[PDB]
Amino acid sequence: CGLVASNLNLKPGECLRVRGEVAPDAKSFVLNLGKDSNNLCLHFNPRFNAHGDANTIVCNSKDGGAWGTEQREAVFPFQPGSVAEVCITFDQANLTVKLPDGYEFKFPNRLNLEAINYMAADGDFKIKCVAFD
Amino acid sequence: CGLVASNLNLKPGECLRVRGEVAPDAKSFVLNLGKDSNNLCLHFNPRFNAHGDANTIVCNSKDGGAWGTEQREAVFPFQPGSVAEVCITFDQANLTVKLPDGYEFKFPNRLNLEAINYMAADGDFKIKCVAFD
Ligand SMILES: CCCO[C@@H]1O[C@H](CO)[C@@H](O[C@@H]2O[C@H](CO)[C@H](O)[C@H](OCc3cn(CC(=O)c4cccc(O)c4)nn3)[C@H]2O)[C@H](O)[C@H]1NC(C)=O
Ligand SMILES: CCCO[C@@H]1O[C@H](CO)[C@@H](O[C@@H]2O[C@H](CO)[C@H](O)[C@H](OCc3cn(CC(=O)c4cccc(O)c4)nn3)[C@H]2O)[C@H](O)[C@H]1NC(C)=O
């Protein structure tokens, strides 16, 4: 288990930036954002090779412990053995996730949070920097 | 409170860098580092005007919930309403705290910690970036 941060108080429009090292033999990594471990407005899960999936970004939510409906994106701007930065903001409608190689997508905001207060990292990604604009 | 982070996995010799905003009306701010909230190898508390002190850094430890003996530093390179970076490293014997304007001091590692896994901020200091080298 990686870094866990709480009391983030990230408000709408504000940008969370996370930079880390993807392991040379990375299979999967996770960035979870929300209120706490049972309440995630974003589970962000790039799979290099995990759960039968190759080079696929899997996203979901978790509401009161229940996983929501999974969604997949169609670009994979991550390499094993490289540094990667991810930038995330939100409003009441969507989270906007900005990634390397110019790519960006929205994920619906399915929870009712006033602020994002919790972040947790897991898997094959070593956090080097977190910034809270 | 302010930001709380766990699973930091900071090891001897590694540098934890914290940048933030000292409030315009600052009286006091705190960075706590250790194993968890009850086991702090460093309670770092710059006091502009608080708890009987003026322009003094107070340091302490907390061991199993019990506060140690306070140490007061000789330097105070902070001002209200400014940005500040603090860099912390540690080893067997001491924490080394590097402050703005080239100041630094040592505080004994009273718990003999071999890893720092917990950090928390409180008071008139808003964390904007946390980095690991
Ligand atoms: C809809 C049902 C379809 O079948 C599958 O069902 C699976 C089980 O529910 C589903 O996987 C789960 O998807 C969730 C998101 O929708 C989560 O990604 C579930 O994992 C949660 C998790 C695991 N971990 C630890 C981790 O990622 C990790 C831990 C250590 C090392 C490492 O490289 C990674 N953290 N969070 C993950 O197990 C698969 O994504 C899903 N596949 C499809 C195509 O939908
Ligand atoms: C004046 C005669 C009594 O002596 C005092 O006794 C005090 C109580 O023991 C002692 O203070 C405590 O020292 C501890 C370290 O030895 C801690 O600093 C105690 O505070 C814990 C604390 C508080 N906070 C929240 C905080 O920093 C904050 C929160 C909101 C606004 C703000 O400006 C600041 N975080 N941690 C702090 O209350 C003071 O250091 C001590 N002072 C002297 C000069 O001896």
Swiss-Prot record, chains A, B:
Q: Extract the Pfam families matched here.
A: Gal-bind_lectin
N6-acetyllysine-modified residues are 11, 27, 106, 126
Q: Which GO terms describe its cellular component?
A: collagen-containing extracellular matrix; cytoplasm; cytosol; endoplasmic reticulum lumen; extracellular exosome; extracellular region; extracellular space; galectin complex
The record's tissue-specificity note reads: Expressed in placenta, maternal decidua and fetal membranes. Within placenta, expressed in trophoblasts, stromal cells, villous endothelium, syncytiotrophoblast apical membrane and villous stroma. Within fetal membranes, expressed in amnion, chorioamniotic mesenchyma and chorion (at protein level). Expressed in cardiac, smooth, and skeletal muscle, neurons, thymus, kidney and hematopoietic cells.
- Where does the protein end up? Secreted, Extracellular space, Extracellular matrix; Cytoplasm; Secreted
Main localization is secreted
List keywords of the entry alphabetically. Answer: Acetylation, Apoptosis, Cytoplasm, Extracellular matrix, Lectin, Phosphoprotein, Secreted
Q: Which residues carry this modification: Phosphoserine?
A: 28
Q: Which CDD domains does this entry report, sorted A to Z? A: GLECT
- Give yes or no: UniProt keyword rRNA processing: no
Q: Which residues bind a beta-D-galactoside?
A: 43-47, 51, 60, 67-70
Q: Which residues form the Galectin domain?
A: 2-133
Modified residue annotations for N6-succinyllysine: 106
Single GO MF descriptor:
receptor ligand activity
Q: Kindly give the PROSITE patterns that the UniProt entry links to this protein.
A: GALECTIN
A GO BP term, please?
A: positive regulation of canonical NF-kappaB signal transduction
Summarize subunit and interaction data from the UniProt record for this chain.
Answer: Homodimer. Binds LGALS3BP. Interacts with CD2, CD3, CD4, CD6, CD7, CD43, ALCAM and CD45. Interacts with laminin (via poly-N-acetyllactosamine). Interacts with SUSD2. Interacts with cargo receptor TMED10; the interaction mediates the translocation from the cytoplasm into the ERGIC (endoplasmic reticulum-Golgi intermediate compartment) and thereby secretion. Interacts with CD69.
Role? Lectin that binds beta-galactoside and a wide array of complex carbohydrates. Plays a role in regulating apoptosis, cell proliferation and cell differentiation. Inhibits CD45 protein phosphatase activity and therefore the dephosphorylation of Lyn kinase. Strong inducer of T-cell apoptosis. Plays a negative role in Th17 cell differentiation via activation of the receptor CD69.
| The protein's name in its UniProt record | Galectin-1
What gene name is given for the protein in this entry? LGALS1
